[PDB]
Amino acid sequence: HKSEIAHRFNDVGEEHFIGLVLITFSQYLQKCPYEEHAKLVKEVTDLAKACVADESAANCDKSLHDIFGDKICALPSLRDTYGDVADCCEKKEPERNECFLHHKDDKPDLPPFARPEADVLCKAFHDDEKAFFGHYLYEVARRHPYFYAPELLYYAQKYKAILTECCEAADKGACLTPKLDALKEKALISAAQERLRCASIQKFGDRAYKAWALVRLSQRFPKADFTDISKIVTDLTKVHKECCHGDLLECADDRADLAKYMCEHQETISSHLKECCDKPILEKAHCIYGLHNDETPAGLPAVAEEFVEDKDVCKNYEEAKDLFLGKFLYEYSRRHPDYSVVLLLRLGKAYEATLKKCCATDDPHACYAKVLDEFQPLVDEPKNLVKQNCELYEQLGDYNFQNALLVRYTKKVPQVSTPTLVEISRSLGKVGSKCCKHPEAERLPCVEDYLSVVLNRLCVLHEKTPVSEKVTKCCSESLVDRRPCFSALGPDETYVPKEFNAETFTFHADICTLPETERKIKKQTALVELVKHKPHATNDQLKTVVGEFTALLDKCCSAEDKEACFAVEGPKLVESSKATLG
Numbered sequence: 001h002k003s004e005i006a007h008r009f010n011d012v013g014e015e016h017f018i019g020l021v022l023i024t025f026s027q028y029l030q031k032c033p034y035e036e037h038a039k040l041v042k043e044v045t046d047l048a049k050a051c052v053a054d055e056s057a058a059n060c061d062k063s064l065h066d067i068f069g070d071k072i073c074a075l076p077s078l079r080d081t082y083g084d085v086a087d088c089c090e091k092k093e094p095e096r097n098e099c100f101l102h103h104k105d106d107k108p109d110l111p112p113f114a115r116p117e118a119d120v121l122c123k124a125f126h127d128d129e130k131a132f133f134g135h136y137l138y139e140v141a142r143r144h145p146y147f148y149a150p151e152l153l154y155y156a157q158k159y160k161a162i163l164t165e166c167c168e169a170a171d172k173g174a175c176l177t178p179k180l181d182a183l184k185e186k187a188l189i190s191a192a193q194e195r196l197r198c199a200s201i202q203k204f205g206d207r208a209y210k211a212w213a214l215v216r217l218s219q220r221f222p223k224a225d226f227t228d229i230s231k232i233v234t235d236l237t238k239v240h241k242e243c244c245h246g247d248l249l250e251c252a253d254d255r256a257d258l259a260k261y262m263c264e265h266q267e268t269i270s271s272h273l274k275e276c277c278d279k280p281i282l283e284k285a286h287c288i289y290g291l292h293n294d295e296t297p298a299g300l301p302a303v304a305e306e307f308v309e310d311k312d313v314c315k316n317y318e319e320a321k322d323l324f325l326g327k328f329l330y331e332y333s334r335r336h337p338d339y340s341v342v343l344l345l346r347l348g349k350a351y352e353a354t355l356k357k358c359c360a361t362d363d364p365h366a367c368y369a370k371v372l373d374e375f376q377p378l379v380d381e382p383k384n385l386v387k388q389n390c391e392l393y394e395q396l397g398d399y400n401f402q403n404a405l406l407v408r409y410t411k412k413v414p415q416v417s418t419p420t421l422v423e424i425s426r427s428l429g430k431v432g433s434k435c436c437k438h439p440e441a442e443r444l445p446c447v448e449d450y451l452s453v454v455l456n457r458l459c460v461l462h463e464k465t466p467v468s469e470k471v472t473k474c475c476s477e478s479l480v481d482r483r484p485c486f487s488a489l490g491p492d493e494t495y496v497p498k499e500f501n502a503e504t505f506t507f508h509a510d511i512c513t514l515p516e517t518e519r520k521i522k523k524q525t526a527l528v529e530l531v532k533h534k535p536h537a538t539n540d541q542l543k544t545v546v547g548e549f550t551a552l553l554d555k556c557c558s559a560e561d562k563e564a565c566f567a568v569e570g571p572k573l574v575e576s577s578k579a580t581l582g
């Protein structure tokens with residue numbers, strides 16, 4: 001393997017190679033049209049093929065970054081399409097590659113992912129599968145420039161499974177949509193989980209992600225020994241570092257090598273692996289990625305005996321910190337399948353901080369004897385929040401619960417851009433729908449782990465154009481304390497309210513063309529803007545002025561001439577709003 005391109009082509013096979021290269025280009029160049037990307041893919045794939053034939057062929061010895069780079073720059077369009085991706089080809093490797101990476105956009109300016117009509121969609125699918133899935137991987141990857149690439153391949157396969165079933169049946173849409181919405185929601189959660197893994201590695205270092213993986217894998221495979229869970233964490237950290245950095249072919253090859261390793265060792269890892277290890281490669285790794293927890297081995301000693309009683313606690317911590325704190329996370333997490341990963345990391349942090357304090361005293365055991373008892377308040381803190389918010393979710397339902405959170409978050413961090421506030425509050429709402437229904441003991445980990453990915457999305461959206469200082473502080477001070485940090489924010493009483501824009505409540509007629517989902521987004525946008533104008537208004541005053549947004553909408557979109565309805569109701573809403581809010 002002196003030729004990388006040949007080595008990856010041979011390892012992943014033509015079909016995945018082509019998909020991974022398409023995703024690679026789609027993530028780096030999110031604005032470029034499909035045609036350009038398919039050209040680059042063929043050019044790279046032709047080069048791959050020339051090298052597999054004869055490793056001595058021209059460019060066969062380049063790095064994958066060189067090859068992607070040399071194909072990108074030779075392309076006619078880029079400098080006109082992009083201002084600052086013109087900039088990058090003005091560097092050499094590794095600077096050139098690093099540059100492309102920093103331009104990845106977490107919210108590229110693109111219209112929503114078009115879901116054509118059921119028969120239309122089924123027709124495209126039968127017409128030309130290859131073109132259909134190429135467009136699919138492009139449209140998702142460009143909108144989610146850190147999506148776990150091997151998993152995006154899996155989603156394309158699932159999408160094909162769903163189409164194959166539904167497209168032939170008597171009603172199309174009726175079969176299709178509940179499945180395509182299930183799939184979309186599962187893929188969005190996948191993208192948000194991977195975005196958190198990349199942000200952990202990139203902002204906080206490999207160790208931030210290794211501790212998170214150690215905890216999760218300890219809980220999933222508690223019968224595995226610390227050595228094996230450690231080897232898996234190491235390999236997984238490498239896989240995610242590669243995928244998060246755009247080394248998609250290496251990431252897919254390494255992930256497939258890991259799945260193969262775990263299958264070849266399943267007896268000593270988990271009996272639950274047999275489900276997965278019988279499947280084809282993408283289903284097999286997907287299955288492993290989300291596998292349900294094994295049962296805890298019977299007969300494990302009391303966790304106090306290694307971590308509080310052993311005379312060598314301070315010695316171990318001082319002489320081999322990561323090994324000893326890793327063993328702490330492995331032992332505590334395997335014993336606690338029903339804690340969120342983040343709580344287990346916060347307990348790991350408290351245990352560490354207690355050792356740091358206690359081991360510098362005359363009597364460390366006297367100092368840290370109660371360390372494990374001192375966890376309970378941390379355990380109990382996320383409980384009260386979950387119970388109060390899940391009863392509010394139960395009572396208000398999705399739409400009003402989202403509204404409630406929208407008003408609460410806009411008052412906490414009112415400098416945040418309205419689209420971000422809307423998107424985050426809507427996501428925080430979906431945590432209610434996903435989590436509140438589970439038995440109480442599964443609720444905590446569901447909610448807490450889900451809130452991590454939603455807050456990380458807020459942090460990554462805010463990172464690029466920082467506008468609020470509390471968000472910068474909560475996002476930058478920790479990974480694991482982000483949720484308590486945001487929880488503790490009261491209303492910002494420092495923010496100067498915005499004065500009243502006429503232009504905020506009339507969006508011409510294009511609004512009349514929007515599906516139900518988008519109308520609600522528009523209402524929610526108006527709500528955020530009302531809160532930014534009048535942060536002290538009552539919930540009922542807010543609702544009223546939105547109710548009157550609901551009217552001016554129904555009115556012009558019930559009326560023959562919406563435009564003339566606009567002159568009559570648009571300012572008049574300026575008026576009725578003054579009446580209601582002052």
Ligand SMILES: C[C@H](C(=O)O)c1cccc(C(=O)c2ccccc2)c1
Pocket residue numbers: 396400401403404407527539540542543546
């Ligand atoms: C009174 C009620 C409660 O606490 O039981 C409550 C509390 C917070 C929010 C809301 C809303 O649904 C809402 C809807 C639109 C705009 C603003 C608020 C309702």
Ligand SMILES: C[C@H](C(=O)O)c1cccc(C(=O)c2ccccc2)c1
Pocket residue numbers: 385386389390393405428429431432433435436447451483486487488489
């Ligand atoms: C952290 C943040 C805050 O309050 O600062 C917040 C906002 C809304 C809800 C929750 C929840 O715990 C929760 C519980 C059930 C469903 C969805 C969210 C937490």
Ligand SMILES: C[C@H](CO)OC[C@@H](C)OC[C@@H](C)O
Pocket residue numbers: 015016018019129130133134153156157158160
């Ligand atoms: C191109 C090929 C069509 O048969 O795509 C099928 C879907 C399921 O997968 C996408 C490829 C890239 O793995």
